[PDB]
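Researcher: Here's my situation. A collaborator sent me these components and asked whether they could plausibly form a single complex. I don't have experimental data yet, so a predicted model of the whole assembly would be a useful starting point for our discussion.
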Amino acid sequence: TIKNFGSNNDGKLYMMLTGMDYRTIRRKDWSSPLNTALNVQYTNTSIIAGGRYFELLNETVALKGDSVNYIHANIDLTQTANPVSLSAETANNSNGVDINNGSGVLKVCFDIVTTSGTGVTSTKPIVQTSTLDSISVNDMTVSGSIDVPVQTLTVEAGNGLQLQLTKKNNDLVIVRFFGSVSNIQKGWNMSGTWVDRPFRPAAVQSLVGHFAGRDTSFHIDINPNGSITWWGANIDKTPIATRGNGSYFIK
Amino acid sequence: TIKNFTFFGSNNDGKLYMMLTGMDYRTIRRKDWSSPLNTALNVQYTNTSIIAGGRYFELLNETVALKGDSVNYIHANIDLTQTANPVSLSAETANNSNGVDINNGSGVLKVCFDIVTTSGTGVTSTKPIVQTSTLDSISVNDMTVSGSIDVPVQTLTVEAGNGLQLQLTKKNNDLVIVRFFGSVSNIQKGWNMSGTWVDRPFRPAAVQSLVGHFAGRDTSFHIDINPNGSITWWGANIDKTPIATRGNGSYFIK
Amino acid sequence: TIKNFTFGSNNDGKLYMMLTGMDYRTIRRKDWSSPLNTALNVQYTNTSIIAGGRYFELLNETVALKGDSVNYIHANIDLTQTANPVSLSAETANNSNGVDINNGSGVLKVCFDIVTTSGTGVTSTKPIVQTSTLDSISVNDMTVSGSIDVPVQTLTVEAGNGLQLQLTKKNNDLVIVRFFGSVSNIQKGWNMSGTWVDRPFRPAAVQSLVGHFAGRDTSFHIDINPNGSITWWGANIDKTPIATRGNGSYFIK
């Protein structure tokens, strides 16, 4: 059975409070769903979809065998007896239908159940997405991963030197050295392209590199203006391969 | 028109809603279900929901007149004494948000939610005010950030001794990048540098070997930052003539 | 006094808990005005609390404290006590019990404040943290005043030829490699003859990591290849080992 404990304005209100759109859910299994043959029984699961709260209380959905089943909550607000029904479908058919601003049936997938010919072999929930703008927090613990913006830049610095720069969170940069340097003196600026503004550090950064197949090393300074100063020893006309990773903060 | 739902207790629900979403009186929740329409020096909110002070209301074809050649700060104003129309919009020359607690006392709440810049003839750009979620501790599985994460940063300059200087920057109380400066002289391999030890908040759990480079040379050194904060020299021996020491090395505290 | 409001109260309770991402072991709490500390008492002037998705207000509500003690202030919710389901207690420990009052019977106890006293009055107060338990967050900007804890994995590799690597990976992305051991019998371009880097630490692209020979002016680098093998790119080393040290960093992604 399904209990359905409203107004369009409350639907919108609740969606805004929790930061959900029409393509996700809030979901809590208070007790575990139970698998029997080609069926899942939701014993006590609460769902919020489109800001509308409902409960799955010993509600069984029947499955297709040897398949990945996409379990959907389907909300039809005019079906005043049973507004919510469950379906098992061959694809994620979530439709993003706005049931608080317009007519229509909201379909939203919340579970993925894989079956053999005779029973359930695995279950994976659909993620519950909280879409937020700016967060001020004291502490955070992450069990998976944080995805931050990444930008890349290849710089032909001059004299054969190449830098491949990767910047994450607009702050941490790792520079990978490539190419082969020749015709440069200590203290000389390299003769090629300056580092693009978004990768320039606030203060001069000395990055250590290594000459491949040798026991010798160099460093370069990436200056705040984007210029690059050579601080290895003088190199004559024979190019020497330059390699290594160096890291700096922009901020 | 403005549809006023959480009004005429409404103050108890207001407080409840503010608490659930983590908002104070100086921010909003806001959703344009359809785009506002800009026409000459006017913005027409076609279908926008706002929560201000935990009070939910809708702007349905509600137009605000704008000042020309100006940055217009669009405010929602909530005055519970104006029983017939407790919410109104204004376009103002500054952000005049006032943080007034309308759920516990009298007063008019003003909160800016849009910034609309105009030429002489119409809207040239619109930028919403950010919706701030003020949270204490978060446990999350995964996060995607489109802008940036700001984490705490601490810096320390250490006169390590023998002319070596370290400038340490620590972020999230964990990742440290050390920048070498100064010039080293009169030191042997294996000796502790004769100066100041690294302050406790920058000390690593395990010894960290940081590679540096001698400016203008093909030669390098490393130092160890020991868990006790001491710094051990692991370049070759250096005589009386100082040699300039540079380079960035990174380590984790934890 | 305690004024109760959220008392289908069970369904609204679960609804509110789900909207804010709270379980039965935390609260939402806001002092709209400052509590008053008066001798061995705290007077909550105007404080709202949500516990188990139930909202209530502490209005001129005084809790007597033990002297020279750390007092754990609890909200206690017993839905069977219809006329006054909520009461406050000051206790010698955090005795929060996580009782599910919206699905089951029982008294929920949840600590929300820690009030420390001298012999005569309050010396400090510290609120209990309000925990938001969320699944996936999509955000524009975030500011953190404390710290972010991300996953950390470590790996020690007996790489071959005497070279040892200690790798630490954070957020499944940033790796810092610490070199140890002493290397011998290797040439430039040769793969180290030991254990390859485990799959979870392998980079998408070849990473050159610079190291230093302890007590010397000389340096080397190794390449960690996407297949997990490690290629020597120092000068050739004969039979006599040389101690290898240093930190190098790379991104996996």
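Model: Some features of this prediction you could bring to your collaborator: The helical segments of chain C are 9-20. The CA atoms of residues 106 and 199 of chain C lie 49 Å apart.
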